[PDB]
């Protein structure tokens, strides 16, 4: 559960709190203890697999890609600059999408986690989602199909012109 | 949602008053129930709206299965007008159909009550359009109406199904089936209304006729429908009025909304497009 313990975890707002409160009638939930025996089998079973799984553990590890200079500075005709920088930009794009995936998942988590209240901590996540989705909306909107770094550039200069037209007045 | 669910309760129930199939009647009934619970959503009380379904299933499955017993028993003759008067011929099915009809009717501590009364009462005490509430009233009357129609013709009369009688209620699995659904049909209203957390937050004050209305409308239903039905028993041939032909032509709706647009399209798809 290192992945559960990974990035979402510091965002994860786990707490939980059982109550425990006996009264005059016998408790039905005791049946779960019988049902617990049904779990126990699988528990033991896991060891019978997990043990063997421990015996040999050739394994992978993460890959990472070095930074490269961007399109903005390669000249109007080099294809190789446009290309390296294109692949970099593309990787960066896919990454950013994955991040928005994460923040949405944490949003779903908060939503279900509330009993009925919310409009609470969920407002907190809702805010960061508002900022994130805002900027991500900005960076990558009407690019259309055949989205390309040269275009995201072409958009970024437009917003910057909006800023310069704004400061004048 | 309310605006339409009400009028579908009414418009369906009217056709339900006057049919001859067992199953068509039960069908119009089920749709009318659906319109009712639909205003139950439209009245902004979703929880009860869900609550009504859980009760509704038992009732309707009861009706169709006992009806299945009748129909299979007789070599399958859906039409009530030559359905026999067999109150004694199949006593167990009789019992079943009776508790069923009472449940759908909304008798005060039987299972259908815990839905229907809470519903229509909540509609009463709610701010809303009233004309729709009126429609809920006529509808809940007509529930009692057709529900008495099927009882009357199914059982009470001297029998008039064609002679030979292959009738045989017996076959134990069927018995066990109807048994279990009766069991739920009587206990479930109380048990479930009790066990569920009070999401409803009850409205229980003014006035007294508030709660009475659900009963009196039913009583008007049985009195009018039954005295009328007995008046049908006194010779004197009459010919139908227009209202009869209307409500018994299912509102004319299928016979116009099917013979018309389909014609203009299938014509158009050849008079023009294909050609």
């Amino acid at each position: 559960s290192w992945d559960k313990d990974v990035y979402p975890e510091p965002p994860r707002r786990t707490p939980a709190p059982a109550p425990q409160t006996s009264l005059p009638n016998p408790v039905t939930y005791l049946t779960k203890i019988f049902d617990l025996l049904v779990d126990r089998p699988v528990t033991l079973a896991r060891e019978f697999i997990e043990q063997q799984h421990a015996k040999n553990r050739y394994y992978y590890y993460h890959r990472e890609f070095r930074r490269v200079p961007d399109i903005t500075e390669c000249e109007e005709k080099d294809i190789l600059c446009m290309f390296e920088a294109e692949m970099q930009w593309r990787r960066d794009y896919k990454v950013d999408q994955e991040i928005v995936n994460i923040i949405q998942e944490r949003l779903k988590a908060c939503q279900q986690r509330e009993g009925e209240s919310y409009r609470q901590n969920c407002a907190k996540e809702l805010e960061q989602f508002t900022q994130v989705s805002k900027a991500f909306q900005d960076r990558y909107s009407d690019l259309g199909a055949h989205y390309s770094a040269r275009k995201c550039l072409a958009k970024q200069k437009q917003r910057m012109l909006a800023e310069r037209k704004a400061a004048k007045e | 949602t309310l605006c339409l669910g009400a009028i579908t309760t009414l418009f369906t129930a009217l056709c339900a008053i006057t049919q001859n199939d067992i199953k068509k009647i039960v069908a119009f009934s089920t749709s009318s129930q659906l319109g009712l619970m639909m205003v139950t959503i439209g009245i902004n009380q979703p929880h009860l709206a869900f609550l009504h379904i859980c009760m509704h299933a038992f009732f309707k499955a009861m009706l169709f299965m006992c009806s299945g017993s009748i129909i299979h028993s007789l070599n399958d003759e859906q039409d009530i007008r030559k359905m026999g008067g067999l109150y004694k011929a199949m006593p167990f099915t009789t019992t079943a159909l009776i508790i069923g009809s009472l449940a759908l009717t909304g008798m005060p501590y039987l299972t259908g009550f815990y839905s229907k009364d809470l519903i229509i009462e909540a509609v009463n005490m709610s701010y809303t359009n009233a004309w729709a509430l009126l429609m809920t009233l006529i509808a809940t009357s007509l529930t009692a109406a057709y529900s008495t129609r099927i009882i009357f013709f199914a059982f009470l009369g001297k029998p008039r199904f064609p002679p030979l009688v292959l009738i045989n209620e017996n076959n134990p699995l069927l018995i066990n089936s109807i048994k279990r659904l009766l069991i739920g049909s009587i206990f479930a209203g109380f048990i479930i209304s009790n066990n569920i957390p009070p999401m409803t937050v009850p409205n229980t004050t003014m006035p007294l006729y508030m709660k009475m209305t659900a009963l009196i409308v039913t009583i008007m239903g049985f009195m009018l429908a039954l005295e009328l039905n007995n008046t049908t028993y006194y010779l004197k041939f009459k010919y139908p009025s227009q209202t009869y032909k209307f409500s018994n032509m299912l509102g004319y709706y299928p016979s116009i909304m099917h013979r018309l647009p389909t014609y203009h399209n299938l014509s158009m798809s050849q008079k023009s497009a294909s050609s």
Binding site: S133, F136, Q137 | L260
Partner: protein, 128 residues
């Protein structure tokens, strides 16, 4: 009784009410005798076809083939230009699509003026 039935294209009058069903003259009775004659002719034929051992395979009736033929291949060769058909064809043809052209184009322009000159743009709509 008084009200009297009124026949329509979707509700043809029942045969029992048709006046032609009643008034009847010996030559018209020759018409029915004729109709039974040809009907009996063809059905006698179909029975001679239907059940002798040696046929095995299907035997299509010519009329159905005339019909399927006339639902396709024969439509064009006839045609004839006629102004009623031609105008009706222009109408069903170019008409409705021009209609949709304006109906979409205006909405497009409206979203344009709101997204740009206005600021009523949707939020969160990052999916695209």
């Amino acid at each position: 009784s008084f009200p009297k039935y009124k026949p329509s294209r979707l509700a043809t009058l029942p045969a029992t009410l048709d006046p032609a069903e009643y008034d009847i003259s010996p030559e018209t009775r020759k018409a029915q005798a004729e109709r039974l004659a040809i009907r009996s002719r063809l059905k006698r034929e179909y029975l001679l076809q239907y059940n002798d051992p040696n046929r095995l395979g299907v035997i299509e009736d010519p009329a159905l083939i005339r019909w399927t033929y006339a639902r396709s291949a024969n439509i064009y060769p006839n045609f004839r230009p006629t102004p009623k058909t031609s105008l009706l064809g222009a109408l069903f043809g170019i008409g409705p699509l021009f209609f949709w052209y304006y109906v979409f184009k205006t909405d497009r322009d409206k979203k344009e003026k709101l997204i740009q000159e206005g600021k009523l743009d949707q939020t969160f709509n990052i999916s695209y």
